Design a protein around this ligand. Structure first.
Ligand SMILES: *[C@@H]1O[C@H](CO)[C@@H](O[C@@H]2O[C@H](CO)[C@@H](O)[C@H](O)[C@H]2NC(C)=O)[C@H](O)[C@H]1NC(C)=O
Ligand SMILES: *[C@@H]1O[C@H](CO)[C@@H](O)[C@H](O)[C@H]1NC(C)=O
Ligand SMILES: *[C@@H]1O[C@H](CO)[C@@H](O)[C@H](O)[C@H]1NC(C)=O
Ligand SMILES: *[C@@H]1O[C@H](CO)[C@@H](O)[C@H](O)[C@H]1NC(C)=O
Ligand SMILES: *[C@@H]1O[C@H](CO)[C@@H](O)[C@H](O)[C@H]1NC(C)=O
Ligand SMILES: *[C@@H]1O[C@H](CO)[C@@H](O)[C@H](O)[C@H]1NC(C)=O
Lengths: 49, 95, 49, 205, 49
C-alpha cells in the first residue's frame, strides 16, 4: 500500500480508534506505523503485519 | 497464615529478569530508526532519491550499523542466559 | 521580471499535483541537473515542502 | 502586574495519533511555573520566539492581534481580525494606527481570507509557516488565570514567508508568555489525548 | 579538524568514531565476562562462611 506518501505492506482492517479530527495517522511505541486514515473517505484503518 | 498476608499485601528477582529482557528487545527495535551516517533510515527513501551506484554506499552504512546492533543483542543474551542457568542449577539442588 | 541575484525570490509550493516529466523533457532548458534524486524517479515522490 | 502559570501552554507537537505512551519531545514550550505579564483594559510587545496568550471574558473585547516587524508600510505584516461577523485573516502592507482599535492602508495584499470564557493561543513562526494552536476552555470565574491542565490543538497553517519581530492586540484581562526550547514528557490517554505532562528541567525530580 | 574543511573532515572523524566505539565495546564485554567469574567466587565464599 501507499497512502499519500506512506509506503508499506500488510493487512488493512477497519479500526475503532477515534483519530482526533487532526491526526493524520497512528503510531505505536518503538515507533512503527500501525494505523492510517484514508484520505478520500477519512476512516481509520489498522495495519497488521 | 502469615506468608499469605505478606504476599497478598517481594518477587523482585522474578520481575527483574522480565524487565531486562523487555528493555533489551525494545532497544533492538529502536535501532531500526537510526541513520548511522546515511541520508535516511528507510530503504524506500534511498531507493527513491538515489541511483543504484549511489544507493549502494548508503545501504552499506545501514547494513553495518544494523549488524552491529543485532550482534550486540546476541552477545548480551548469552551472558544473561549463563546467569539464569546457574540460578536454575541452584534451584535444582535445593529441590 | 525575475529578481536580482543578491536579493533572490523564494516561492513556496503548497498542496498541488506537480508534473516534473513535462519539465524534464521541455527541450528549452540549457541545464537540468538534479542532485538529491535521480530525475526519472521524480514523479512518484511526495515532498513535504 | 505579573502572575504565575502553573501547567499551561501545552500543544500537540504534530499530527500522528497516539495512546498511553509517556512520549518524550524536544520543542518550544512555555516552562512550568513561569512569569507571565498581566494586562488590564494596549502596547507593542516583542515576539522573539513564539507566544502564549490567554484571555478571559463573556463579551468579546479581544478582537485579534496584529503581527510583523514594523507594523507599518515599507515592510509586510499580518493582520488577524474579528468583527461581530467572523475572522478576517489578511496579509498586506499596512499603515497601522499607533493606537489601533481601523487601519489606514491595505496595499500590495499577498494573502486574503474572509468568511466566563478562557481562550488560549500559541503562535509560532517557522520556515515561512505561521502556526497557530488554540483551545477554548470555560472558566467558572470571570477574568483571573486559573489552574489546571489543558492541551492546545492546532488550528491554522499559513505559508506566508513574513518576518516577525513584534505584535499587538485589538480591543472593542490578558497575559503574554514566551516560549523556549525545552524537553517535556507527555502522557497520552487511550483515546490519544494529552492528559498530563512533566517539565524535565524544573528541578532534580 | 583544523587542517580540513567540514565535508572533508567528517569522513575522517567517522573512522575515528568507529574505532573508538569498537574499543569501548570490547572493554565492556570483557568486564561483563570477568564480573560473572567474580560473582561465582563470592557465592562460594558466602557458602563457606
Ligand atoms: C472525495 O470525493 C468523493 C467522491 O469523489 C467523496 O465521496 C462522497 O462521500 C459522501 C459522504 O459524505 C457521499 O454522500 C457521496 O455520495 C460520495 N461521492 C461519491 C461519488 O461516492 C468524498 O467524500 C470526498 N472526500 C471528502 C473528504 O469529502
Ligand atoms: C517576574 O520578573 C519581574 C522582573 O523584575 C519580577 O519583579 C517579578 O517578581 C517576577 N515574578 C515572579 C512571579 O517571579
Ligand atoms: C468584517 O470585517 C471585514 C474586514 O475587511 C470586512 O470585509 C467585512 O465586510 C466585515 N463585516 C461586515 C458585515 O461588513
Ligand atoms: C508595493 O506597493 C508600492 C506602493 O504602492 C509599489 O511601489 C510597489 O511596486 C508594490 N510592490 C510590488 C511588488 O509591486
Ligand atoms: C528576516 O530578517 C533577517 C534580518 O537578519 C533577514 O536576514 C532575513 O532575510 C529576513 N527574512 C527573509 C525571509 O528575508
Ligand atoms: C475516551 O476516553 C474515555 C476515558 O479515557 C473512555 O471512557 C471513552 O470510551 C473514550 N472514547 C470516547 C469518549 O469516544
Amino acid at each position: 500500500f501507499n497512502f499519500n506518501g506512506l509506503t508499506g505492506t500488510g493487512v488493512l482492517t477497519e479500526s475503532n480508534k477515534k483519530f482526533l479530527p487532526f491526526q493524520q495517522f497512528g503510531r505505536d511505541i518503538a515507533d512503527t506505523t500501525d494505523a492510517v486514515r484514508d484520505p478520500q473517505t477519512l476512516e481509520i484503518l489498522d495495519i497488521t503485519p | 497464615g502469615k506468608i499469605q498476608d505478606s504476599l497478598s499485601s517481594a518477587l523482585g528477582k522474578l520481575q527483574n529478569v522480565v524487565n531486562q529482557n523487555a528493555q533489551a528487545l525494545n532497544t533492538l527495535v529502536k535501532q531500526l530508526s537510526s541513520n548511522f551516517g546515511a541520508i535516511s533510515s528507510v530503504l524506500n527513501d534511498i531507493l527513491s532519491r538515489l541511483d543504484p551506484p549511489e544507493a549502494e554506499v548508503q545501504i552499506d552504512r545501514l547494513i553495518t550499523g544494523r549488524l552491529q546492533s543485532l550482534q550486540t543483542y546476541v552477545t548480551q543474551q548469552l551472558i544473561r542466559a549463563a546467569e539464569i542457568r546457574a540460578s536454575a542449577n541452584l534451584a535444582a539442588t535445593k529441590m | 521580471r525575475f529578481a536580482s541575484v543578491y536579493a533572490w525570490n523564494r516561492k513556496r509550493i503548497s498542496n498541488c499535483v506537480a508534473d516534473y516529466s513535462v519539465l524534464y523533457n521541455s527541450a528549452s532548458f540549457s541545464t537540468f541537473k538534479c542532485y538529491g534524486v535521480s530525475p526519472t524517479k521524480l514523479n512518484d515522490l511526495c515532498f513535504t515542502n | 502586574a505579573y502572575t504565575n502559570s502553573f501547567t499551561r501552554g501545552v500543544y500537540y507537537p504534530d499530527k500522528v495519533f497516539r495512546s498511553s505512551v509517556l512520549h518524550s519531545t524536544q520543542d518550544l514550550f512555555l516552562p512550568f511555573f513561569s512569569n507571565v505579564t498581566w494586562f488590564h483594559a494596549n502596547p507593542v510587545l516583542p515576539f522573539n520566539d513564539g507566544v502564549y496568550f490567554a484571555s478571559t471574558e463573556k463579551s468579546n473585547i479581544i478582537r485579534g492581534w496584529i503581527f510583523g516587524t514594523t507594523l507599518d508600510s515599507k515592510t509586510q505584516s499580518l493582520l488577524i481580525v474579528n468583527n461581530a461577523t467572523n475572522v478576517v485573516i489578511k496579509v498586506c502592507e499596512f499603515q497601522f494606527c499607533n493606537d489601533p482599535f481601523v487601519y489606514s492602508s491595505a496595499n500590495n495584499c499577498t494573502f486574503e481570507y474572509v468568511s466566563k470564557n478562557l481562550r488560549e493561543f500559541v503562535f509560532k513562526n517557522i520556515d515561512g509557516y505561521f502556526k497557530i494552536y488554540s483551545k477554548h476552555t470555560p472558566i467558572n470565574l470571570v477574568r483571573d488565570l486559573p489552574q489546571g491542565f489543558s492541551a492546545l490543538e492546532p488550528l491554522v497553517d499559513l505559508p506566508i514567508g513574513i518576518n516577525i519581530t513584534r505584535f499587538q492586540t485589538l480591543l472593542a484581562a490578558y497575559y503574554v508568555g514566551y516560549l523556549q526550547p525545552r524537553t517535556f514528557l507527555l502522557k497520552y490517554n487511550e483515546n490519544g489525548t494529552i492528559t498530563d505532562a512533566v517539565d524535565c528541567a524544573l528541578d532534580p525530580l
